Enzyme design. Structure first.
Site, PDB file in Angstrom:
ATOM      1  N   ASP A 431      36.801  17.295 -43.511  1.00  0.00           N
ATOM      2  CA  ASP A 431      37.390  16.291 -42.608  1.00  0.00           C
ATOM      3  C   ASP A 431      36.362  15.193 -42.332  1.00  0.00           C
ATOM      4  OD1 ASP A 431      39.007  14.877 -40.884  1.00  0.00           O
ATOM      5  OD2 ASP A 431      38.956  16.330 -39.250  1.00  0.00           O
ATOM      6  N   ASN A 433      36.277  11.991 -41.800  1.00  0.00           N
ATOM      7  CA  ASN A 433      36.429  11.018 -40.723  1.00  0.00           C
ATOM      8  C   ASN A 433      36.751  11.667 -39.374  1.00  0.00           C
ATOM      9  OD1 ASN A 433      39.083  11.729 -41.567  1.00  0.00           O
ATOM     10  ND2 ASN A 433      39.834   9.607 -41.497  1.00  0.00           N
ATOM     11  N   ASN A 435      39.383  13.431 -38.037  1.00  0.00           N
ATOM     12  CA  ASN A 435      40.662  13.127 -37.394  1.00  0.00           C
ATOM     13  C   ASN A 435      41.646  14.297 -37.415  1.00  0.00           C
ATOM     14  OD1 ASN A 435      41.334  13.082 -40.095  1.00  0.00           O
ATOM     15  ND2 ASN A 435      42.608  11.237 -39.953  1.00  0.00           N
ATOM     16  N   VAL A 437      42.845  15.868 -40.019  1.00  0.00           N
ATOM     17  CA  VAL A 437      43.648  15.894 -41.239  1.00  0.00           C
ATOM     18  C   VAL A 437      42.701  16.058 -42.423  1.00  0.00           C
ATOM     19  CG1 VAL A 437      45.398  14.733 -42.584  1.00  0.00           C
ATOM     20  CG2 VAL A 437      45.239  14.280 -40.128  1.00  0.00           C
ATOM     21  N   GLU A 439      40.847  16.559 -46.242  1.00  0.00           N
ATOM     22  CA  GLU A 439      40.801  15.947 -47.561  1.00  0.00           C
ATOM     23  C   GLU A 439      40.486  17.030 -48.574  1.00  0.00           C
ATOM     24  OE1 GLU A 439      37.841  14.585 -45.527  1.00  0.00           O
ATOM     25  OE2 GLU A 439      39.458  13.728 -44.300  1.00  0.00           O
ATOM     26  N   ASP A 501      44.568  18.436 -61.687  1.00  0.00           N
ATOM     27  CA  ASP A 501      43.367  17.697 -62.079  1.00  0.00           C
ATOM     28  C   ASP A 501      43.521  16.374 -62.844  1.00  0.00           C
ATOM     29  OD1 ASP A 501      43.795  18.527 -64.725  1.00  0.00           O
ATOM     30  OD2 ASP A 501      42.069  19.893 -64.756  1.00  0.00           O
ATOM     31  N   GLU A 549      43.444  11.302 -47.812  1.00  0.00           N
ATOM     32  CA  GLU A 549      44.063  12.442 -47.164  1.00  0.00           C
ATOM     33  C   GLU A 549      45.360  12.701 -47.882  1.00  0.00           C
ATOM     34  OE1 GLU A 549      44.010  10.938 -43.142  1.00  0.00           O
ATOM     35  OE2 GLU A 549      42.001  11.750 -42.777  1.00  0.00           O
ATOM     36  N   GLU A 727      53.314  28.085 -68.653  1.00  0.00           N
ATOM     37  CA  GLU A 727      52.897  27.329 -67.476  1.00  0.00           C
ATOM     38  C   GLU A 727      53.807  26.182 -67.031  1.00  0.00           C
ATOM     39  OE1 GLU A 727      48.578  26.499 -67.076  1.00  0.00           O
ATOM     40  OE2 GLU A 727      48.356  27.469 -69.032  1.00  0.00           O
TER      41      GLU A 727
HETATM   42 CA   LIG Z   1      40.455  13.492 -42.296  1.00  0.00          CA
END
Ligand SMILES: [Ca+2]
Ligand SMILES: OC[C@H]1O[C@H](O)[C@H](O)[C@@H](O)[C@H]1O
EC number: 3.2.1.-
Length: 760
Positions: A431, A433, A435, A437, A439, A501, A549, A727
């Site tokens: 996280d 930043n 906040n 939420v 990443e 990926d 995010e 797959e």
């Molecule tokens: Ca964040």
């Protein structure tokens, strides 16, 4: 019940190479494994394999390698003349069977697993007169082939001079001993591993280098018993002997144990009476696939686990990932819950604890890849073990499902603190930043940074490689843009952590696609994902984050919070439950406000821009990189408002977007980086597909979801055939790609059977 499901997967084969590979380097036959055992078997297909189960497959710690084509193959002789048999051979869930028929002699052979290291063959012989029995076998000599055609003239002995395979007679059969080989990417043995054959009757064995012939004489009708054991350490060898004695002492008990265990899998698992015979057989395929990919404890993994594929190039041994595990256990909860539980334990068994010797700054982190052999950093010689990153978390959802079936509150009590530790880890180390939420990102690692903690990267321009470090230099180089490519090992691991990926949303797009994007009015920099380091108050490097995010990750965090709330209530922890409820609500509000585009009426990732938006969102929805399956992640996970779900369901059902020949692929047809043959930019995966269907259902569109399931059932290639599960699918043609016997697909094919397949 098992007898209703003969040859669900083609398990025939007579391999001639250790690496008898398909086009993508996966073993091209589908051997039978059970009880988490470390060896498997194929069915005979013709006169040259008749009388034995060819293709002994050894799981050499982290890989699958064939040992032999014919090994312990029976021929019968009566008065100096060989008896000519005809063959019937078939698999059922939990067993391989072959019947040999001649006028005066018949043989019925049933092969089941008896322990986590041993299979049991019953050889039931009917004959009114005496017989001479002969068994033969031979180790493979040739190394490698692709599509049945050799890649080279390399031999196994030649490639691995220390392998030193030797067949020796024993007091009750024979054994194959193996030398120590530490071929990190091919073949791993301890120097103490063995393949043992024990038999219930006296035999006489002649050995000729890497072949053998065994003889016995019987007086008439008789049932013989033979054990086959792949044992990987000296201590496994020692411990197995009393088991093998018990098996030969009580063979009927072991046969019944396997019969009953499999009846139970099928009884517990086949619980959709609306499903057709074809649809139910798909569920049986998934059950056989998942159970075959289950491995008992081995090496550093102290629990039963399930890998993505026992036949896979890089998915065999007991190599275990978290993403795969969540879905695996979700499904296996409904038929093999004990191993579902174990699989989850396996993943959390190497969760980082305080004081960790390698990464004390990652408490609660769950490794990306665990395996028999630890990495050199933890004292082993393993090349696969990976702590550069984790995977997206559906851990709580997985645990809760096991609880839904079992109603076992002790299971919740066991997993809750481990789930909370992982939760807290996401919020500390992913996280950037701050906040709330998360990443996708990467850990501090030898591959990612110098010892002083300066992020490594390599700048490329033409044929010049410039390897630098430090986040100062990275920012200084990104602006200039005078590079063909910028290789950031930590950002590679962040792509692994995302689980997708080469996805559009993460900045992946081909040259011709990008040219068209620019010609249509966009900028190249629209596809640049910026990257950042994560540090604590005191300046400790915790890892890295994409400056982005992800809406799927945010939605999985919503999931995590929702299910931890329920777990807290079950456990009588009302105040913790309330906190998670509030965190869940906060994420839902963020996802709906920040990630849902008013204009295109769909969800997207947001960048972490240089400064947040006035509404506190990290940045704007990344509309321009086009629509993907993450757009329905809020529906699946229950974060979406009804309005936003209605909008998203319109797009999913739109034939110009996701309602393709096989619907709900990994990029909309309108995505600027779409390609029907690209793994994460077009191809349909059964997990993302099923998440879509569940998401639709949750917001009142079960009817439309059932229609898509019908479309999938009619259009996905190979579904009603006897081929191994793979797959993904081309969304336009339905064509299959990927590793055979793939757990993740099997898991969600099972779920589709339970939730959405039905007679039309
Ligand atoms: Ca964040
Ligand atoms: O070696 C680790 C690596 O294994 C496979 O390649 C996975 O697809 C990647 O996401 C990553 O986990």
């Amino acid at each position: 019940n098992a007898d209703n499901y003969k040859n669900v997967i083609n398990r025939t084969g007579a391999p001639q190479y250790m690496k008898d590979y398909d086009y993508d380097d996966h073993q091209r036959f589908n051997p039978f494994f059970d009880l988490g055992a470390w060896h498997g078997h194929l069915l005979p297909d013709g006169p040259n394999t008749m009388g034995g189960f060819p293709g002994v497959a050894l799981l050499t710690e982290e890989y699958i390698n064939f040992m032999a084509s014919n090994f312990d193959r029976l021929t019968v002789w009566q008065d100096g003349k060989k008896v000519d048999f005809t063959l019937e051979a078939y698999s059922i869930p939990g067993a391989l069977v072959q019947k040999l028929t001649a006028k005066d002699v018949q043989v019925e052979m049933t092969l089941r697993f008896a322990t986590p290291r041993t299979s049991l063959l019953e050889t039931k012989i009917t004959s009114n007169k005496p017989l001479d029995l002969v068994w033969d076998g031979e180790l493979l000599e040739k190394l490698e082939a692709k599509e049945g055609k050799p890649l080279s003239d390399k031999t196994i002995a030649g490639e691995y001079p220390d392998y030193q395979r030797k067949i020796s007679a024993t007091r009750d059969g024979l054994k194959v001993t193996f030398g120590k080989v530490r071929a990190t990417w091919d073949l791993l043995t301890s120097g103490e591993s063995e393949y043992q054959v024990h038999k219930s009757l006296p035999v006489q064995t002649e050995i000729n280098g890497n072949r053998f012939t065994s003889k016995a004489h019987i007086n008439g009708s008789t049932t013989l018993y033979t054990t086959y054991s792949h044992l990987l350490t000296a201590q496994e060898v020692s411990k197995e002997q009393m088991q093998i004695r018990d098996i030969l002492a009580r063979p009927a008990f072991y046969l019944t144990a396997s019969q009953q265990r499999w009846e139970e899998y099928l009884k517990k698992g086949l619980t959709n009476p609306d499903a057709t015979p074809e649809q139910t057989r798909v569920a049986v395929k998934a059950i056989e696939t998942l159970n075959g990919n289950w491995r008992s404890p081995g090496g550093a993994v102290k629990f039963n686990t399930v890998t993505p594929s026992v036949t896979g190039r890089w998915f065999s041994g007991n190599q275990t990932w978290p993403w795969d595990t969540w879905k695996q256990a979700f499904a296996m909860a409904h038929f093999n819950p004990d191993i579902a539980k174990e699989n989850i334990r396996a993943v959390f068994s190497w969760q980082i604890q305080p004081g960790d010797s390698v990464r004390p700054q990652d408490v609660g982190f769950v490794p990306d890849l665990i395996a028999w052999n630890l990495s050199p950093e933890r004292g082993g010689d393993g090349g696969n073990w990976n702590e550069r990153n984790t995977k997206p978390s559906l851990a709580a959802w997985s645990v809760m499902e096991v609880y839904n079936v079992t109603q076992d509150k002790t299971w919740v009590a066991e997993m809750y603190p481990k789930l909370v530790a992982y939760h807290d880890w996401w919020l500390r180390n992913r996280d950037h930043n701050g906040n709330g939420v998360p990443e996708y990102g990467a850990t501090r690692d030898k591959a990612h940074n110098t010892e002083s903690g300066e992020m490594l990267f390599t700048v490329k321009k033409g044929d010049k490689e410039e390897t630098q470090s430090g986040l100062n230099n990275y920012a200084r180089v990104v602006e200039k843009g005078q590079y063909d490519s910028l290789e950031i090992p930590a950002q590679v691991a962040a792509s692994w952590e995302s689980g997708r990926d080469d996805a559009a949303v993460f900045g992946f797009i081909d040259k011709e696609q990008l040219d068209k994007y620019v010609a249509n009015g966009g900028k190249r920099s629209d596809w640049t994902v910026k990257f950042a380091e994560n540090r604590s108050q005191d300046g400790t490097l915790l890892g890295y984050s994409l400056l982005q995010e992800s809406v799927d990750q945010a939605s999985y965090m919503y999931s995590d919070n929702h299910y931890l709330a329920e777990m807290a209530t079950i456990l009588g922890k009302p105040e913790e439950a309330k906190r998670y409820r509030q965190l869940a609500q906060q994420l839902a509000d963020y996802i709906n406000t920040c990630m849902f585009d008013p204009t295109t009426q769909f969800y997207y990732d947001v960048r972490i821009e240089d400064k947040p938006l006035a509404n506190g969102c990290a940045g704007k929805p990344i509309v321009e990189r086009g629509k993907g399956p993450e757009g329905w992640s809020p529906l699946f996970n229950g974060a979406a408002t009804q309005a936003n779900a209605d909008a998203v369901v319109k797009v999913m059902l739109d034939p110009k977007e996701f309602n393709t020949f096989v619907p709900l692929g990994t990029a909309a047809l309108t995505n600027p980086a779409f390609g029907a043959d690209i793994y994460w930019r077009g191809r349909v995966w059964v997990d993302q597909f099923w998440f879509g269907l569940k998401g639709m259902e949750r917001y009142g569109y079960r009817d439309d979801a059932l229609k898509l399931a019908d479309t999938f059932f009619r259009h996905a290639k190979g579904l009603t055939a006897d081929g191994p599960i793979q797959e993904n699918y081309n969304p336009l043609t339905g064509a299959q790609q990927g590793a055979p016997n793939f757990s993740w697909s099997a898991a969600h094919l099972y779920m589709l059977y339970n939730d959405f397949f039905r007679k039309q």
